Amino acid sequence: SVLAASKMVGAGCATIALAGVGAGLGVMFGSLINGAARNPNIAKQLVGYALLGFALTESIALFSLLVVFLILFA
Amino acid sequence: SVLAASKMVGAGCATIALAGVGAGLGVMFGSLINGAARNPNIAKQLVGYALLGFALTESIALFSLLVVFLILFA
Amino acid sequence: SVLAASKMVGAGCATIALAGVGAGLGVMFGSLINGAARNPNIAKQLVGYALLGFALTESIALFSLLVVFLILFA
Amino acid sequence: SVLAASKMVGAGCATIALAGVGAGLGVMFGSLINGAARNPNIAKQLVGYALLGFALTESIALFSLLVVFLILFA
Amino acid sequence: SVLAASKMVGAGCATIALAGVGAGLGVMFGSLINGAARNPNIAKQLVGYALLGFALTESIALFSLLVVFLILFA
Amino acid sequence: SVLAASKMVGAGCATIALAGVGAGLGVMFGSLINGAARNPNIAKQLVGYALLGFALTESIALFSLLVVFLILFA
Amino acid sequence: SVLAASKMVGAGCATIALAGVGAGLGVMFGSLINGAARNPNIAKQLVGYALLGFALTESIALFSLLVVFLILFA
Amino acid sequence: SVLAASKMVGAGCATIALAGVGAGLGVMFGSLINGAARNPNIAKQLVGYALLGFALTESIALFSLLVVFLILFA
Amino acid sequence: SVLAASKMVGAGCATIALAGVGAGLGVMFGSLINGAARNPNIAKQLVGYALLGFALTESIALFSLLVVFLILFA
Amino acid sequence: SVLAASKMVGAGCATIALAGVGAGLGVMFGSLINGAARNPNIAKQLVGYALLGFALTESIALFSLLVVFLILFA
Amino acid sequence: LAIADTYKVRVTFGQASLIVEELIKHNPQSYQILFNKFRSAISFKPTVATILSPDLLEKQLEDVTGNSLDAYDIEASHERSDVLRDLTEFHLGVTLYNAMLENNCS
Amino acid sequence: APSGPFYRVAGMSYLRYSNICADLLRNVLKEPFKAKAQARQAIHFRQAPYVDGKAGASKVYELENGIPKTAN
């Protein structure tokens, strides 16, 4: 059964792309700590930019994760 | 059924390009938080630069998902 | 057992996603020590953004082991 | 038909070249927001160098897509 | 036993997860040095952040060695 | 013909060299934006220095496209 | 013996963790040089913090080589 | 021709070393656009060190292209 | 002849850990030139920090080359 | 056959450690330019720091190429 | 130390800078300047103007529930103790130049 | 010995550095304006160390073109 053997190794290397999203999403949450250390008077505004950005890069963490479920179940 | 095997391995490696856009989106969304912490009165223009950059960085993320569908379902 | 053998080489390919999400954690918990040294009046509120970001970048890490629960045991 | 299988695994490994331009485009759009927050009076001029920077990083993203379509369909 | 040989070839490539964990951990300890170099008085508090983030960045290493002990010994 | 089948895998894994050169571009084209936000009196002279960089970094993008065209038909 | 042939191709990819461990290790002694140039008085306390982070970043490098030995010699 | 099939897949796989030298001269040329904009006093002198930096970072390129122009033809 | 052939491909896939140890060592040697530009009167003490940090960054590279010689020659 | 075929594959994966040496040389020689733009009177004294690091980073661009001849010619 | 013949031609900032520098030959924790401030042509209220030394005593008085200086993001080339050294000497040179202009027309 | 900027590591204060950059900027104005800025360039005073309460040496300053650029 080499086709089912091809889907476990394929979707497994497909979800390597969560590493670059996890590296990017930590830079943005790192700039949230560093940016709110400059002026905390916009710190509750800046978390509105971090959680806006968290949604838009974990978009891509589900874009790749779509393909992992597009491989394993289709 | 070895052509139908490599279409789900060649689609796995194809979406590791999404690691790069997830790294680039988090730098830019971190660059707006550090950017809007400098002078937050130009911040509603800088989100106009962020979601211009989120638009074009995700475009090559959809060049790669186009190629992911072209190996999977074409 | 060639189906179940591929379920372990695919599970090792999925575990590389936990590399880059540790890089985003070292970047973010690096930015806590830079930020809390800049403005140590915010030294614990910046933990409130670090553990908020650590819990939302381990949103990606718990997604990565969700695949490792999906190719190992399914 | 091991050749027709061979082009899928080649072309998916060909479009991992979109990872670096996807991380290159995020830094280039990130230094725009870091450039427009420092000097906002020339902010709409800096997009004039950023869009020259966008078209010349996706110059390579088409050069990878030169090879992706040269494997899949040629 | 292709399966028993697959408990090695997967568990080796599962342990590239300690690459990005170590590359992050040198950043966050690297920001302890700069964070202590800026403010040398509160350097005994910032090591209570650089060890706090170490136990939270080994959280992912205790999720990768969770996996290499679910392949080699499970 | 496993040669012409390995011809597709070798040329596809060759052009991952286009990832890193495109990542170097956005750092070079980001500091083009950043260098001209910090000295706009030489804002078009740095574009000469940037395209002097762009004239030499795509040498890698034409040292690597030769070896792709040395696998494909040579 | 493919059982032993997978032990040597598995343990080879097991030590790519040492790429990222050495990457953070240069970054940590990169900020030790930089941070001692900021505060030359506290520069030997930073040596106490450099080897502090060196032992704890190598702790996962000595977690990696045991897994290289848990493939080959286990 | 399993010997002839492998001497192109290793030939292409070696060229990914030229990716990192592409992000090398990209950050090296980006450090002159930052360097000469900091002071255009030595804007002519600094190109001497970037072009000294250019040829000696290519020293890696023709050493990576040493074996690429070796295993293809020896 | 699989045990003599896999120990070559496992050896080349083992010495990729000389990438990140070169990326880290290039940061630390670049941070030495930066650290002399901050404080030139301390300069040959930080060279004592670089070469000590070079020999401790090379604690990775001889641990990874240990793996390269052990599977070529256990 | 497979032995003399795997020596063409293991030699290709062996020299991709040069990607970090070419990226390490890029952040170092660029840091020469950033260090000499700031403290330009010791600009001749800093290339006596850069080439010392260039020869001591090259070691790894030799030590990987000593593995690439122990794969081909051993 | 005795400075005299200051008001002979005119008082400049470069002249007040060299008077400031010799107050930095001594390395105190503070400076006190005593001068007559020219409010009007009638009242000359004597002023005490004081300047603290940067990382010796100026940073220490700012440590009020943390620090009051950490709100500012230092855009210097070197770190905060070197920008405060340049800033205190620039504070000493203008407080002294204003002192011998207020006192010259008082 | 010292740590700081390029003027601070050479034994030059900030006031001596920043007056030099004000010295050299005054010279490159128009002579309608350079002669006006020539007035604030002159330094004339005398300092005297007083060791005992009674006596000491004295050091007269007569520079008309700005601060001493030389090492003092």
Side-chain angles (χ1 to χ4, degrees), chain A, chain B, chain C, chain D, chain E, chain F, chain G, chain H, chain I, chain J, chain K residues 1-19 21-106, chain L:
Chain A
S1 181
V2 76
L3 185 130
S6 174
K7 283 177 298 169
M8 316 294 131
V9 71
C13 70
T15 175
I16 298 178
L18 292 178
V21 183
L25 195 145
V27 174
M28 184 216 69
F29 272 113
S31 299
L32 167 74
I33 308 174
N34 181 68
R38 313 299 192 84
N39 41 356
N41 294 115
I42 57 158
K44 279 293 281 174
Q45 172 196 10
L46 284 177
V47 78
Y49 300 120
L51 298 182
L52 178 140
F54 159 73
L56 290 189
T57 76
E58 212 177 68
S59 177
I60 312 299
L62 297 172
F63 270 25
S64 73
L65 268 178
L66 177 64
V67 179
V68 180
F69 304 143
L70 188 69
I71 289 285
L72 282 159
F73 295 91
Chain B
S1 162
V2 74
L3 163 65
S6 88
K7 289 193 314 166
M8 311 174 101
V9 167
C13 297
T15 185
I16 320 175
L18 301 196
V21 294
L25 287 192
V27 165
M28 166 185 53
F29 291 157
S31 293
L32 84 93
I33 295 179
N34 278 334
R38 275 208 81 103
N39 41 6
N41 281 147
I42 64 162
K44 295 301 155 178
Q45 180 203 355
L46 294 181
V47 194
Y49 294 147
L51 309 182
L52 185 134
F54 167 73
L56 300 195
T57 316
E58 201 178 67
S59 70
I60 39 187
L62 303 182
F63 278 119
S64 65
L65 282 174
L66 187 70
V67 169
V68 160
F69 285 126
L70 255 60
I71 282 103
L72 256 186
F73 306 107
Chain C
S1 181
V2 73
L3 189 147
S6 66
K7 293 194 311 190
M8 270 81 84
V9 64
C13 280
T15 318
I16 310 170
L18 297 179
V21 81
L25 274 170
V27 161
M28 188 193 71
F29 277 119
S31 295
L32 162 72
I33 319 175
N34 291 321
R38 258 194 202 275
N39 207 350
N41 295 117
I42 321 183
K44 303 179 190 299
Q45 174 169 312
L46 287 188
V47 193
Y49 300 117
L51 315 183
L52 192 142
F54 159 75
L56 275 183
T57 191
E58 293 177 350
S59 178
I60 299 173
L62 262 64
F63 294 163
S64 297
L65 302 167
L66 189 156
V67 176
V68 184
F69 193 44
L70 190 64
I71 48 193
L72 276 181
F73 301 105
Chain D
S1 178
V2 76
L3 191 142
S6 169
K7 60 176 62 171
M8 314 299 180
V9 65
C13 294
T15 177
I16 319 178
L18 295 181
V21 301
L25 194 62
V27 183
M28 197 277 305
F29 274 124
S31 307
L32 177 57
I33 320 184
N34 267 345
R38 201 177 158 84
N39 201 358
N41 292 117
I42 60 164
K44 294 184 178 183
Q45 180 187 353
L46 294 162
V47 196
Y49 315 99
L51 293 195
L52 193 139
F54 157 73
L56 291 184
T57 58
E58 73 100 20
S59 176
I60 287 178
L62 300 199
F63 285 173
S64 86
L65 282 173
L66 190 146
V67 184
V68 167
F69 285 104
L70 209 63
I71 292 308
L72 286 172
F73 308 122
Chain E
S1 293
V2 169
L3 188 144
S6 160
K7 276 153 73 72
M8 278 80 78
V9 72
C13 78
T15 58
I16 321 170
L18 282 302
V21 166
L25 203 153
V27 167
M28 59 86 62
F29 265 109
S31 294
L32 171 72
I33 302 186
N34 303 148
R38 292 320 183 86
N39 201 344
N41 284 161
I42 63 159
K44 276 77 181 174
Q45 177 166 315
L46 301 185
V47 289
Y49 293 143
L51 295 173
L52 190 148
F54 172 76
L56 293 189
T57 198
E58 296 280 72
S59 178
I60 317 108
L62 269 74
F63 292 162
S64 176
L65 312 176
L66 185 63
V67 167
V68 79
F69 298 161
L70 284 176
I71 285 182
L72 276 165
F73 315 119
Chain F
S1 178
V2 296
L3 178 133
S6 176
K7 187 163 298 283
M8 307 307 170
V9 179
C13 76
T15 181
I16 313 176
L18 280 182
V21 60
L25 282 181
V27 182
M28 189 262 284
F29 281 107
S31 84
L32 162 71
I33 304 168
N34 189 70
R38 301 176 159 216
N39 206 356
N41 317 106
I42 48 168
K44 191 62 189 293
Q45 186 259 324
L46 296 178
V47 180
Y49 277 164
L51 299 177
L52 191 148
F54 188 79
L56 288 177
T57 177
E58 260 84 7
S59 69
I60 303 297
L62 62 90
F63 286 0
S64 64
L65 264 63
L66 285 176
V67 71
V68 178
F69 295 154
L70 275 193
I71 300 299
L72 286 176
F73 324 107
Chain G
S1 68
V2 311
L3 185 144
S6 295
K7 277 156 63 75
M8 299 182 186
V9 76
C13 296
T15 196
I16 309 172
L18 266 66
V21 172
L25 192 51
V27 157
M28 189 179 179
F29 298 131
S31 72
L32 162 79
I33 300 177
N34 163 74
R38 317 299 202 111
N39 206 337
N41 305 322
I42 317 296
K44 297 183 183 296
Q45 185 181 331
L46 298 179
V47 178
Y49 298 137
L51 318 172
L52 175 68
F54 164 73
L56 273 73
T57 195
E58 195 76 352
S59 69
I60 79 156
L62 272 72
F63 279 3
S64 197
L65 271 76
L66 70 86
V67 176
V68 183
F69 299 153
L70 285 176
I71 294 285
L72 287 163
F73 311 117
Chain H
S1 79
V2 291
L3 198 152
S6 75
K7 81 171 57 184
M8 291 183 287
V9 69
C13 191
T15 306
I16 319 173
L18 286 88
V21 320
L25 88 166
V27 306
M28 185 215 56
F29 278 131
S31 296
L32 183 137
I33 316 178
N34 281 349
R38 157 164 316 270
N39 44 358
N41 181 281
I42 53 169
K44 253 56 167 177
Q45 195 187 4
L46 287 182
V47 183
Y49 312 99
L51 294 195
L52 189 139
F54 170 77
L56 312 174
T57 198
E58 220 69 356
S59 180
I60 307 308
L62 87 163
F63 284 173
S64 55
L65 291 172
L66 179 63
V67 314
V68 170
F69 285 125
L70 183 65
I71 71 172
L72 276 167
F73 312 117
Chain I
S1 182
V2 67
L3 198 40
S6 71
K7 61 169 45 59
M8 306 293 166
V9 67
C13 286
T15 190
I16 322 180
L18 311 189
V21 81
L25 203 71
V27 159
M28 186 204 58
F29 281 146
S31 179
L32 169 68
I33 319 165
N34 263 337
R38 278 305 152 105
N39 195 0
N41 299 146
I42 202 178
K44 266 177 291 287
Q45 160 196 323
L46 312 165
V47 188
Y49 286 170
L51 296 169
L52 184 140
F54 151 76
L56 255 55
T57 304
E58 278 290 314
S59 157
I60 297 300
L62 62 92
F63 283 3
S64 54
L65 272 185
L66 187 148
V67 167
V68 176
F69 306 143
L70 189 146
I71 64 174
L72 278 176
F73 323 108
Chain J
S1 295
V2 170
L3 186 148
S6 75
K7 297 188 290 179
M8 295 311 131
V9 177
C13 298
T15 183
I16 73 173
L18 298 195
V21 179
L25 262 54
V27 291
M28 188 203 65
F29 280 127
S31 174
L32 168 66
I33 310 168
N34 183 39
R38 289 173 181 264
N39 195 349
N41 72 86
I42 49 168
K44 313 302 174 77
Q45 206 263 330
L46 290 186
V47 308
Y49 285 143
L51 299 179
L52 190 145
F54 167 66
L56 270 298
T57 322
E58 207 54 18
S59 79
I60 297 301
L62 280 178
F63 294 156
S64 70
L65 291 175
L66 305 186
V67 166
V68 88
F69 294 158
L70 263 61
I71 287 297
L72 292 162
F73 311 128
Chain K
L1 174 68
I3 292 98
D5 291 333
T6 293
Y7 319 95
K8 295 284 278 284
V9 278
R10 71 195 76 84
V11 180
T12 65
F13 189 80
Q15 171 197 36
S17 301
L18 290 167
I19 308 171
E21 282 183 39
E22 190 66 28
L23 307 187
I24 313 161
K25 297 309 188 64
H26 317 86
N27 280 324
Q29 312 291 115
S30 160
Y31 300 88
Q32 313 272 355
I33 321 292
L34 267 299
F35 67 101
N36 290 266
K37 185 153 189 76
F38 184 70
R39 299 305 310 159
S40 63
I42 302 99
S43 62
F44 322 109
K45 206 79 87 183
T47 313
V48 177
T50 180
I51 295 99
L52 304 155
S53 290
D55 48 288
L56 281 78
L57 210 76
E58 166 61 60
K59 290 178 74 70
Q60 293 187 5
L61 267 294
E62 297 297 318
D63 284 334
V64 182
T65 176
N67 203 305
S68 177
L69 204 64
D70 305 344
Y72 298 94
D73 282 289
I74 300 303
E75 202 263 332
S77 51
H78 296 72
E79 61 95 18
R80 192 167 87 191
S81 70
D82 287 333
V83 74
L84 257 68
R85 176 71 61 167
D86 301 318
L87 210 51
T88 282
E89 302 184 8
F90 188 37
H91 182 23
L92 181 67
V94 64
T95 325
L96 203 64
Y97 170 76
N98 187 64
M100 52 185 44
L101 256 71
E102 291 267 9
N103 196 274
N104 188 38
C105 76
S106 297
Chain L
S3 178
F6 73 102
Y7 48 86
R8 190 65 67 173
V9 293
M12 174 191 305
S13 64
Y14 182 66
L15 294 149
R16 208 172 283 238
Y17 157 76
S18 188
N19 280 290
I20 276 169
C21 311
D23 274 5
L24 305 159
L25 187 53
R26 285 178 209 121
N27 307 329
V28 198
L29 313 175
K30 302 180 173 312
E31 216 78 13
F33 301 99
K34 172 162 177 42
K36 182 53 209 171
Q38 185 52 258
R40 69 169 68 108
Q41 216 162 306
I43 300 168
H44 298 85
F45 74 109
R46 59 174 175 85
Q47 54 178 351
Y50 261 69
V51 283
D52 66 332
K54 181 180 178 181
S58 67
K59 200 209 300 187
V60 185
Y61 286 84
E62 316 182 80
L63 287 86
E64 183 274 344
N65 279 315
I67 218 161
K69 298 195 175 84
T70 177
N72 288 359

